[PDB]
Short mmCIF file of N, CA and C in Angstrom, two decimals:
data_model
loop_
_atom_site.label_atom_id
_atom_site.label_comp_id
_atom_site.label_asym_id
_atom_site.label_seq_id
_atom_site.Cartn_x
_atom_site.Cartn_y
_atom_site.Cartn_z
N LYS A 191 -287.27 103.91 -78.99
CA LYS A 191 -286.69 104.76 -79.78
C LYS A 191 -287.06 104.24 -81.08
N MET A 192 -287.12 102.90 -81.12
CA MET A 192 -287.52 102.18 -82.26
C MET A 192 -288.86 102.63 -82.75
N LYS A 193 -289.79 102.68 -81.85
CA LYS A 193 -291.12 103.08 -82.18
C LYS A 193 -291.21 104.39 -82.81
N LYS A 194 -290.45 105.23 -82.28
CA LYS A 194 -290.40 106.54 -82.72
C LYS A 194 -289.88 106.67 -84.12
N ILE A 195 -288.89 105.88 -84.41
CA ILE A 195 -288.28 105.90 -85.71
C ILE A 195 -289.23 105.38 -86.74
N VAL A 196 -289.85 104.26 -86.43
CA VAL A 196 -290.84 103.64 -87.31
C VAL A 196 -292.01 104.56 -87.53
N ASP A 197 -292.52 105.07 -86.42
CA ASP A 197 -293.67 105.94 -86.45
C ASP A 197 -293.39 107.16 -87.28
N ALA A 198 -292.18 107.69 -87.13
CA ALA A 198 -291.77 108.87 -87.86
C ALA A 198 -291.67 108.60 -89.36
N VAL A 199 -291.12 107.44 -89.71
CA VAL A 199 -290.95 107.07 -91.11
C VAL A 199 -292.27 106.75 -91.78
N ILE A 200 -293.05 105.92 -91.11
CA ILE A 200 -294.37 105.52 -91.57
C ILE A 200 -295.26 106.73 -91.68
N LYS A 201 -295.12 107.60 -90.75
CA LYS A 201 -295.93 108.75 -90.75
C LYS A 201 -295.78 109.59 -91.95
N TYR A 202 -294.60 109.53 -92.49
CA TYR A 202 -294.28 110.33 -93.61
C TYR A 202 -294.22 109.59 -94.84
N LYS A 203 -295.23 108.92 -95.14
CA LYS A 203 -295.18 108.25 -96.33
C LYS A 203 -296.18 108.70 -97.32
N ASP A 204 -295.66 108.85 -98.49
CA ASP A 204 -296.43 109.26 -99.62
C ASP A 204 -297.29 108.17 -100.20
N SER A 205 -298.58 108.45 -100.21
CA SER A 205 -299.55 107.54 -100.77
C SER A 205 -299.47 106.19 -100.11
N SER A 206 -300.29 105.26 -100.56
CA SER A 206 -300.23 103.94 -99.96
C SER A 206 -299.15 103.11 -100.60
N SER A 207 -298.73 103.46 -101.81
CA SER A 207 -297.70 102.68 -102.46
C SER A 207 -296.33 103.16 -102.06
N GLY A 208 -296.27 104.38 -101.53
CA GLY A 208 -295.01 104.93 -101.12
C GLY A 208 -294.27 105.59 -102.24
N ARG A 209 -295.01 106.22 -103.11
CA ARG A 209 -294.43 106.88 -104.21
C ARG A 209 -294.24 108.32 -104.05
N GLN A 210 -293.04 108.76 -104.33
CA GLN A 210 -292.77 110.15 -104.23
C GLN A 210 -291.49 110.50 -104.97
N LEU A 211 -291.04 111.71 -104.87
CA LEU A 211 -289.81 112.13 -105.59
C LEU A 211 -288.61 111.35 -105.11
N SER A 212 -288.62 111.00 -103.82
CA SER A 212 -287.50 110.26 -103.25
C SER A 212 -287.42 108.86 -103.80
N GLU A 213 -288.41 108.50 -104.55
CA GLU A 213 -288.49 107.19 -105.10
C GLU A 213 -287.24 106.87 -105.97
N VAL A 214 -286.54 107.94 -106.37
CA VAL A 214 -285.31 107.89 -107.15
C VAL A 214 -284.16 107.34 -106.32
N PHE A 215 -284.27 107.53 -105.01
CA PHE A 215 -283.25 107.09 -104.09
C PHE A 215 -283.67 105.87 -103.30
N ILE A 216 -284.71 105.21 -103.76
CA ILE A 216 -285.20 104.04 -103.11
C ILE A 216 -284.39 102.86 -103.51
N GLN A 217 -284.12 102.77 -104.78
CA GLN A 217 -283.38 101.67 -105.29
C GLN A 217 -282.14 102.07 -105.99
N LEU A 218 -281.04 101.51 -105.54
CA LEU A 218 -279.78 101.81 -106.13
C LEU A 218 -279.39 100.85 -107.21
N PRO A 219 -278.89 101.39 -108.34
CA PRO A 219 -278.46 100.56 -109.42
C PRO A 219 -277.28 99.72 -109.02
N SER A 220 -276.76 99.06 -110.01
CA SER A 220 -275.63 98.23 -109.84
C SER A 220 -274.40 99.01 -110.08
N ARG A 221 -273.38 98.50 -109.55
CA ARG A 221 -272.11 99.08 -109.71
C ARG A 221 -271.68 99.17 -111.09
N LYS A 222 -272.01 98.17 -111.75
CA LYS A 222 -271.69 98.07 -113.09
C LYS A 222 -272.42 99.00 -113.91
N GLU A 223 -273.60 99.21 -113.46
CA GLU A 223 -274.45 100.05 -114.14
C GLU A 223 -273.94 101.43 -114.06
N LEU A 224 -273.46 101.74 -112.89
CA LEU A 224 -273.01 103.05 -112.59
C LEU A 224 -271.75 103.01 -111.72
N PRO A 225 -270.65 102.54 -112.29
CA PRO A 225 -269.38 102.44 -111.58
C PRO A 225 -268.90 103.78 -111.09
N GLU A 226 -269.31 104.81 -111.79
CA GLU A 226 -268.93 106.14 -111.45
C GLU A 226 -269.42 106.53 -110.11
N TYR A 227 -270.62 106.10 -109.84
CA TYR A 227 -271.26 106.39 -108.61
C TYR A 227 -270.44 105.85 -107.46
N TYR A 228 -269.95 104.65 -107.65
CA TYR A 228 -269.15 104.00 -106.66
C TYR A 228 -267.87 104.73 -106.39
N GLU A 229 -267.25 105.22 -107.44
CA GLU A 229 -266.00 105.93 -107.26
C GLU A 229 -266.21 107.29 -106.72
N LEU A 230 -267.27 107.91 -107.18
CA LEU A 230 -267.54 109.24 -106.76
C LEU A 230 -268.00 109.24 -105.33
N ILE A 231 -268.92 108.33 -105.05
CA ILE A 231 -269.47 108.19 -103.73
C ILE A 231 -269.16 106.90 -103.17
N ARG A 232 -268.53 106.97 -102.06
CA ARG A 232 -268.24 105.82 -101.39
C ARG A 232 -269.32 105.36 -100.65
N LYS A 233 -270.27 104.90 -101.34
CA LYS A 233 -271.35 104.28 -100.69
C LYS A 233 -272.56 104.88 -100.73
N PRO A 234 -273.09 104.59 -101.80
CA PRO A 234 -274.35 104.96 -102.03
C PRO A 234 -275.26 104.09 -101.22
N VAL A 235 -276.13 104.76 -100.52
CA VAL A 235 -277.15 104.11 -99.73
C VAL A 235 -278.48 104.50 -100.34
N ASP A 236 -279.45 103.63 -100.24
CA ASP A 236 -280.80 103.92 -100.69
C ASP A 236 -281.82 103.69 -99.57
N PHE A 237 -283.06 104.04 -99.85
CA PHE A 237 -284.15 103.89 -98.89
C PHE A 237 -284.37 102.43 -98.49
N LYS A 238 -284.18 101.53 -99.43
CA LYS A 238 -284.36 100.09 -99.14
C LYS A 238 -283.33 99.62 -98.20
N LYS A 239 -282.14 100.12 -98.39
CA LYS A 239 -281.05 99.72 -97.58
C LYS A 239 -281.30 100.03 -96.13
N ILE A 240 -281.80 101.22 -95.91
CA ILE A 240 -282.11 101.68 -94.58
C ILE A 240 -283.27 100.91 -94.06
N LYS A 241 -284.26 100.77 -94.90
CA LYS A 241 -285.43 100.08 -94.51
C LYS A 241 -285.20 98.66 -94.12
N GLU A 242 -284.36 98.05 -94.87
CA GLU A 242 -284.02 96.69 -94.66
C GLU A 242 -283.22 96.49 -93.42
N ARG A 243 -282.31 97.38 -93.23
CA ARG A 243 -281.46 97.32 -92.10
C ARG A 243 -282.15 97.51 -90.82
N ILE A 244 -282.95 98.53 -90.79
CA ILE A 244 -283.67 98.84 -89.61
C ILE A 244 -284.59 97.72 -89.23
N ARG A 245 -284.96 96.95 -90.20
CA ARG A 245 -285.79 95.85 -89.97
C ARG A 245 -285.26 94.91 -88.96
N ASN A 246 -283.97 94.87 -88.92
CA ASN A 246 -283.29 94.03 -88.01
C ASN A 246 -282.78 94.79 -86.83
N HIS A 247 -283.27 96.00 -86.67
CA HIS A 247 -282.86 96.84 -85.57
C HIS A 247 -281.46 97.27 -85.72
N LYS A 248 -281.16 97.78 -86.85
CA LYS A 248 -279.85 98.23 -87.12
C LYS A 248 -279.60 99.56 -86.48
N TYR A 249 -280.57 100.44 -86.66
CA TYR A 249 -280.51 101.76 -86.11
C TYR A 249 -281.18 101.81 -84.77
N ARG A 250 -280.73 102.74 -83.96
CA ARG A 250 -281.28 102.91 -82.63
C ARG A 250 -281.37 104.28 -82.15
N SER A 251 -280.95 105.16 -82.96
CA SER A 251 -280.94 106.49 -82.57
C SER A 251 -281.45 107.26 -83.67
N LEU A 252 -282.24 108.22 -83.37
CA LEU A 252 -282.73 108.94 -84.46
C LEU A 252 -281.68 109.77 -85.12
N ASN A 253 -280.68 110.19 -84.40
CA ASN A 253 -279.66 111.02 -85.00
C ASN A 253 -279.00 110.34 -86.12
N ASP A 254 -278.78 109.07 -85.89
CA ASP A 254 -278.09 108.26 -86.83
C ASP A 254 -278.81 108.24 -88.13
N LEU A 255 -280.07 108.01 -88.02
CA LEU A 255 -280.91 107.95 -89.17
C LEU A 255 -280.96 109.25 -89.89
N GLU A 256 -281.14 110.30 -89.13
CA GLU A 256 -281.24 111.60 -89.71
C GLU A 256 -280.04 111.94 -90.50
N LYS A 257 -278.95 111.57 -89.93
CA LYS A 257 -277.70 111.80 -90.52
C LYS A 257 -277.55 111.15 -91.84
N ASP A 258 -278.10 109.97 -91.91
CA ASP A 258 -278.05 109.19 -93.10
C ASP A 258 -278.82 109.85 -94.20
N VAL A 259 -279.99 110.31 -93.83
CA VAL A 259 -280.88 110.96 -94.76
C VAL A 259 -280.25 112.20 -95.33
N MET A 260 -279.69 113.01 -94.44
CA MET A 260 -279.06 114.26 -94.83
C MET A 260 -277.89 114.01 -95.72
N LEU A 261 -277.18 112.97 -95.37
CA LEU A 261 -276.03 112.59 -96.12
C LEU A 261 -276.37 112.16 -97.52
N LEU A 262 -277.44 111.43 -97.63
CA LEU A 262 -277.90 110.94 -98.89
C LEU A 262 -278.24 112.08 -99.85
N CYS A 263 -278.87 113.12 -99.31
CA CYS A 263 -279.24 114.29 -100.09
C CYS A 263 -278.00 114.93 -100.70
N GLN A 264 -276.98 115.07 -99.88
CA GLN A 264 -275.73 115.66 -100.31
C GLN A 264 -275.05 114.90 -101.37
N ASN A 265 -275.06 113.61 -101.18
CA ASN A 265 -274.41 112.73 -102.10
C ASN A 265 -275.03 112.86 -103.47
N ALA A 266 -276.34 113.06 -103.50
CA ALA A 266 -277.05 113.21 -104.75
C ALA A 266 -276.66 114.51 -105.44
N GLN A 267 -276.53 115.57 -104.67
CA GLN A 267 -276.15 116.86 -105.21
C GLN A 267 -274.74 116.86 -105.73
N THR A 268 -273.90 116.09 -105.09
CA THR A 268 -272.50 115.98 -105.48
C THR A 268 -272.38 115.46 -106.89
N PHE A 269 -273.28 114.55 -107.22
CA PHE A 269 -273.26 113.90 -108.50
C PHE A 269 -274.10 114.67 -109.51
N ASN A 270 -275.23 115.13 -109.05
CA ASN A 270 -276.17 115.88 -109.87
C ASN A 270 -275.83 117.36 -109.85
N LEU A 271 -276.29 118.07 -110.85
CA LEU A 271 -276.07 119.51 -110.88
C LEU A 271 -277.31 120.27 -110.77
N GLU A 272 -277.14 121.56 -110.90
CA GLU A 272 -278.26 122.41 -110.89
C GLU A 272 -278.86 122.50 -112.26
N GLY A 273 -280.16 122.38 -112.26
CA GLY A 273 -280.92 122.47 -113.47
C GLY A 273 -281.37 121.13 -113.95
N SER A 274 -282.00 120.39 -113.07
CA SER A 274 -282.41 119.06 -113.39
C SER A 274 -283.48 118.59 -112.43
N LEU A 275 -284.16 117.55 -112.82
CA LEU A 275 -285.22 117.00 -112.02
C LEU A 275 -284.76 116.55 -110.67
N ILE A 276 -283.61 115.97 -110.67
CA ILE A 276 -283.02 115.42 -109.47
C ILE A 276 -282.69 116.49 -108.51
N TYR A 277 -282.15 117.56 -109.04
CA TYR A 277 -281.79 118.68 -108.23
C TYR A 277 -283.01 119.19 -107.53
N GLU A 278 -284.08 119.29 -108.29
CA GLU A 278 -285.32 119.75 -107.77
C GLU A 278 -285.86 118.89 -106.68
N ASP A 279 -285.76 117.61 -106.88
CA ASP A 279 -286.24 116.64 -105.93
C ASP A 279 -285.48 116.72 -104.62
N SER A 280 -284.21 117.01 -104.72
CA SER A 280 -283.36 117.10 -103.56
C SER A 280 -283.74 118.30 -102.69
N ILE A 281 -284.16 119.38 -103.33
CA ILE A 281 -284.58 120.59 -102.62
C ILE A 281 -285.87 120.39 -101.90
N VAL A 282 -286.81 119.80 -102.61
CA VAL A 282 -288.12 119.53 -102.05
C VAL A 282 -288.03 118.66 -100.83
N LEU A 283 -287.28 117.60 -100.98
CA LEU A 283 -287.10 116.63 -99.92
C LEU A 283 -286.58 117.23 -98.66
N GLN A 284 -285.55 118.01 -98.87
CA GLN A 284 -284.85 118.67 -97.82
C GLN A 284 -285.84 119.52 -97.07
N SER A 285 -286.67 120.27 -97.83
CA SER A 285 -287.63 121.20 -97.25
C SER A 285 -288.61 120.50 -96.35
N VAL A 286 -289.09 119.41 -96.86
CA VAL A 286 -290.02 118.56 -96.19
C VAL A 286 -289.39 117.90 -94.96
N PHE A 287 -288.17 117.42 -95.14
CA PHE A 287 -287.44 116.76 -94.08
C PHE A 287 -287.20 117.71 -92.92
N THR A 288 -286.89 118.94 -93.26
CA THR A 288 -286.63 119.99 -92.28
C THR A 288 -287.83 120.24 -91.40
N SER A 289 -288.96 120.29 -92.06
CA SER A 289 -290.22 120.56 -91.43
C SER A 289 -290.58 119.48 -90.42
N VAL A 290 -290.35 118.24 -90.80
CA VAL A 290 -290.65 117.08 -89.94
C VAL A 290 -289.78 117.09 -88.73
N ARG A 291 -288.61 117.30 -89.09
CA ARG A 291 -287.51 117.39 -88.27
C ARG A 291 -287.64 118.44 -87.16
N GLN A 292 -288.02 119.61 -87.60
CA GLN A 292 -288.22 120.75 -86.74
C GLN A 292 -289.32 120.49 -85.81
N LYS A 293 -290.32 119.92 -86.38
CA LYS A 293 -291.41 119.61 -85.62
C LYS A 293 -291.02 118.66 -84.60
N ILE A 294 -290.56 117.52 -85.04
CA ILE A 294 -290.14 116.46 -84.16
C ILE A 294 -289.27 116.93 -83.05
N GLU A 295 -288.46 117.88 -83.32
CA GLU A 295 -287.60 118.41 -82.33
C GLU A 295 -288.27 119.20 -81.37
#
């Protein structure tokens, strides 16, 4: 299941450096930096967090992961509004994620 998860993630990577719009959700600031985020969202997760975790075999089910991803998108919209770069990025991502997802299914 592991393989599948890795293969699925690796498969979908932008460029060799891994740069893309989601790059905004790769690294999470500090609490201090953004205490609001902490209060607003109980737990901001980023791509590194997932990546790091899975490294140790944290996840085992694709549902779990998917859920996380979907959740992350929402969390961003909760904080962000319409009419912004972030908003745009969240739509694109979702679209792309859906496609992978659909396929994979």
